[PDB]
């Protein structure tokens, strides 16, 4: 009825998707073998947003898992939930992407793309009324960035009304993996602004400071970082599956946070994150979810909105709760701080209330917020492109693949007006 076709790309995308599907499948009560052994009847009525049918009460996801080397999805199949994925939905090449986006934008990923479009158009036309798609990828890779921006572009030219959404994993600016991550990440952003009209930013160093300083773990891992990418991700689609008092789909999220089609770069967060030994001391009420969700520390981008300006705000609430305390705190954070909120928009916050709490909890909350504090993400990635580029350093990897150097200069310059767009909403 309101289906979501889920698209993944890369080593990030195959190991974010493998953990997110561990979250929905126990949210809806699905065992590791496919079938349903839940306890209520609300876990079965709206399951078709993500799952399909089979023989014998077996439900198989509407996912497509895409990569450019066969070794990445050997661990995605050997997982606790590896045998619930349909065997044809995995797409793999043989030669790698090599941390070079044009290898996967023109040569390797441009010949893998036409076998995935034969897959995504098979799982899209089985939807009775598809709401839209969803992508998770890393701009700093070669597969999910070189080819994942090709996969966006061939589904926005064909299906131009349904939603396209992106849980992008942008490069962290302080300490990151790969040296040549500027080129694969800067260049894909200019081909990302046209074709999505909703995009988040999940920086991997903004997941480390939560799982160390707030969750108070000893050895964090990537398995304890995909729990935070996923608990956000089900927390934006939760009224589409569980009935509540004020619903909001994935379409009504955008309507109240993108007022111009170049303004779709938000900053996620997630509120009830407490340490186990420090769980007894916490007070647990409504205004200690709106307390912790709006701290700049909690935020899942590595950029602060004290420097910037909350253009609009959204929030989704789960759990049976009281509309007086939901609606007064949202007013309360907004009235005190005039300098953090724009002029020319009177009310900046949207509210949604689901009923079913997440697994192991009674209440929760999720945040999506538009800012002009995310053009401080883009200037620090466009200072290290043009530092490296005007000395022509790594250039032979890229311009020896059939890619002009005038093609660099447009996404060097015409990307930068999007940066100069956001500072004119520092004015009125």
């Amino acid at each position: 009825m309101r289906e979501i076709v889920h698209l993944q790309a890369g080593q990030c995308g195959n190991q974010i998707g493998a953990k997110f599907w561990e979250v929905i499948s126990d949210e809806h009560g699905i065992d590791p073998t496919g079938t349903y052994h839940g306890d209520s009847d609300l876990q079965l009525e709206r399951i078709n947003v993500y799952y399909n049918e089979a023989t014998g009460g077996k439900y198989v996801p509407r996912a497509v898992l895409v990569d450019l080397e066969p070794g990445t999805m050997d661990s995605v199949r050997s997982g606790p939930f590896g045998q619930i994925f349909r065997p044809d939905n995995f797409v793999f090449g043989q030669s790698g992407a090599g941390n070079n986006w044009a290898k996967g934008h023109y040569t390797e990923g441009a010949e893998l793309v036409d076998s995935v479009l034969d897959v995504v158009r098979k799982e899209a036309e089985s939807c009775d009324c598809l709401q839209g798609f969803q992508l998770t990828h890393s701009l700093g890779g070669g597969t999910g960035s070189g080819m994942g921006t090709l996969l966006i572009s061939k589904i926005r030219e064909e299906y131009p009304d349904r939603i396209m959404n992106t849980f992008s994993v942008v490069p962290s600016p302080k300490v990151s993996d790969t040296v040549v991550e500027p080129y694969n990440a800067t260049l894909s952003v200019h081909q990302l602004v046209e074709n999505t009209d909703e995009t988040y930013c999940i920086d991997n160093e903004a997941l480390y400071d939560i799982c160390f300083r707030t969750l108070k773990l000893t050895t964090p891992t990537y398995g304890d970082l995909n729990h935070l990418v996923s608990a956000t991700m089900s927390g934006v689609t939760t009224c589409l599956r569980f009935p509540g008092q004020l619903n909001a789909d994935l379409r009504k999220l955008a309507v109240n946070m993108v007022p111009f089609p170049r303004l779709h770069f938000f900053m996620p967060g997630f509120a009830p994150l407490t340490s186990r030994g420090s769980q007894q001391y916490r007070a647990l009420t409504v205004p200690e979810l709106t307390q912790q969700m709006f701290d700049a520390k909690n935020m899942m981008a590595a950029c602060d909105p004290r420097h910037g300006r909350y253009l609009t705000v959204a929030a989704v609430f789960r759990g049976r709760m009281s509309m007086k305390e939901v609606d007064e705190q949202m007013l309360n954070v907004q009235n005190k701080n005039s300098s953090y909120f724009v002029e020319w928009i009177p009310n900046n916050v949207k509210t949604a209330v689901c009923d079913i709490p997440p697994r192991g909890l009674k209440m929760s909350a999720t945040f999506i917020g538009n800012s002009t504090a995310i053009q401080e993400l883009f200037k620090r990635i466009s200072e290290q492109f043009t530092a490296m580029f005007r000395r022509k350093a790594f250039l032979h990897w890229y311009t020896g693949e059939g890619m002009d150097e005038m093609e660099f200069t447009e996404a060097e310059s015409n990307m930068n007006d999007l940066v100069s767009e956001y500072q004119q909403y520092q004015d009125a």
Binding site: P80, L217, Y222, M321, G360, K362, M363
Partner: protein, 53 residues
């Protein structure tokens, strides 16, 4: 005089029914306090450190 005594009796019957409903509404608000309270069980905490990559 008979009708005035009957009227006073009707008002006192109203008072008794209101008293019963007041005790039940106290019960309802005491139950409603324990829904906006949050509490995280051990399932949420066993969600962490399960994948050692």
């Amino acid at each position: 005089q008979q009708q005035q005594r009957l009227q006073r009796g009707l008002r006192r019957a109203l008072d008794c029914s209101n008293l019963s409903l007041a005790r039940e509404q106290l019960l309802q608000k005491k139950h409603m306090k324990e829904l906006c309270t949050n509490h995280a069980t051990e399932d949420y905490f066993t969600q962490f450190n399960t994948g050692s990559r």
